[model samples]
Target: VNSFSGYLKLTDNVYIKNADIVEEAKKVKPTVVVNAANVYLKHGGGVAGALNKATNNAMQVESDDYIATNGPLKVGGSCVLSGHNLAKHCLHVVGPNVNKGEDIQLLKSAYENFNQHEVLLAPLLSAGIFGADPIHSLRVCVDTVRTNVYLAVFDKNLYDKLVSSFL
Candidate 1:
């Protein structure tokens, strides 16, 4: 409940963006990827209703490891490391619902090996604030994370293209 939940653009769908992110991730062998999008059963359905099945599956993939931290749920990246000892290289792209004061520190530690591709690929979600809007969420998160590394914000259609260009 201590989250920065906000209104999604209704026009901006995270599922599409996530798929593109995943494809780009596949380019790297055994990549330790993190997705910073949030879609939970608690959110009910979605703007379009029923929600995208793909998105639902992805959410479930990281669900059990989901940590409610301070606010908003965060699926732990370690879950993906289940089979590989290289999991130490794993990281989660959890949402920014947790307090920046606390979450930012967690990210710093999670990404200690910032130069490595696996460590850098983690997707960390962030939004403006509850009752606000998605754009604000994007802007706030971009600004906060950019302080540590370059940040990118793109629409669903251009999402893969946008991030792919970076790697």
Candidate 2:
């Protein structure tokens, strides 16, 4: 409903930016709020791919690399919902898409890195927002994130509900 660019092909659905998501989070009064999205690193592949390639391998977007990863409050990935890492944890939540089928495999590496770095990485789905085979990506996510997933669907009523839950 706010200023959304509609990345990740959510059917006819549109997604707002993290700054908007941040405005909602502020009113909710929750700790460790985060915004995530399904995106394509394209040639880079996944979280590591993008950040790793950034700064020519001098930078890595690790889970705990919260600072370098631009986390600990806000995080974003896939170049779609990323610009707003200005908060605490800008998580580049990864998922499979089109040519990025290896997104599922990338998750294995993400989690491995998360554990190695001692970070708490949660999972979510934008479900209804990303129509036209949303479940296809979700299925790939399930295989990837491996059971530590959280339900963070960004729809109208449901989106408000999750935000309120944090409140």
Candidate 3:
């Protein structure tokens, strides 16, 4: 439940926190929860894994349909999951895959594609296996959203790092 809040130039509000992303997203009750998904649409690790577990793997199935019809998600592309268990909507963003040398551009695109909504819950994209530093990823997200955006940081170490950087 610990968090820091402030207003960014183009965003209505911005918050950085150390808590379960899914739990915090529920508390915030955002209109959409953005998940940094893999190209294959498998939720076997990282944020995707946690989300799959929380929603009883529902997101996995939803993502599958999206990928099947649209082809394996390209970096920076997104798919939506409505009627999800945790949030009103889940926006699965195919972000940078470190194995392929992809970077934060995908994260930026995801945020850019989300400007229509009033509220959004996002994790630090490309900060996990994609290998971008959490702080850098946060910066990219903040710059990209350009409007109401909520960032959820579950890793305690990264949360502290963000707090220190801001301080």
Candidate 4:
């Protein structure tokens, strides 16, 4: 497997990579894999979709079960579901939809959920559909995680953006 690209430190350091997290999860197999999810927790597209497919789509049903049992997940809230082909547990976290007017603290709260795992595989939360800035999101992701982390980046554009920002 490809090792991390490098490390970045806010309060502490996190490993980063310019690879597909779904594929990486199958290899490195971290204890927890995070999904940058919606209030509904549906794993339809983007990282959520890829992770769901990699895990055989059971999570979608589990997601439906979660929402049915609890209620729609709110921003910053999370629900844990069984893991399959990849990591041991998948954490579904609702990051802020920044373009629609939510704030940074919400994004940070969603990221804080990553602290629940000792070994983590996390994407740049809230930076995609939620419209949060990639650089800002990267910083928040790095700062909030308290355990060993491997941050995944699949977008070439954002990869370059982070490179310019010293990733």
Q: How much lDDT does each candidate structure score?
A: 0.33, 0.33, 0.72, 0.79
Q: Which candidate is the best by TM-score?
A: 4
- State the lDDT of candidate 3 residue by residue for 1-167, as single tens digits: 32324322223456665667778765655668888787788889888888888888778887788778878877887777763777889888777876678765667786676676666777877777767777777777766775566677777787778877762
* Model 4: lDDT of residue 62: 84
Candidate 4 per-residue lDDT over residues 12-55, each given as its tens digit? 55776777888877876767888888889878887898888876
The count of backbone overlaps in candidate 1 is 7
| Residue-by-residue lDDT tens digits, candidate 1, 14-68 | 2123333333333432334443433342322221011123244434343433534
- Taking every candidate in turn, the Cα RMSD to the unseen true structure, in Å, is 11.8, 12.0, 3.6, 2.8
Give the winner by lDDT: 4
Across 1-167, the per-residue lDDT of candidate 2 in tens digits comes to 22123323222222222223333333332222223334332224223333334324332334324443443321123321232223233344433333433333443343332222112222343233222243433444444432222223434564444344331
Can you give the lDDT of residue 48 in candidate 3?
Answer: 83
Error of 4 at 98 (Å): 2.2
- Per-candidate TM vs. native? 0.34, 0.31, 0.84, 0.87
Better of 1 and 3 by TM-score: 3
Question: Model 3: number of clashes?
Answer: 0
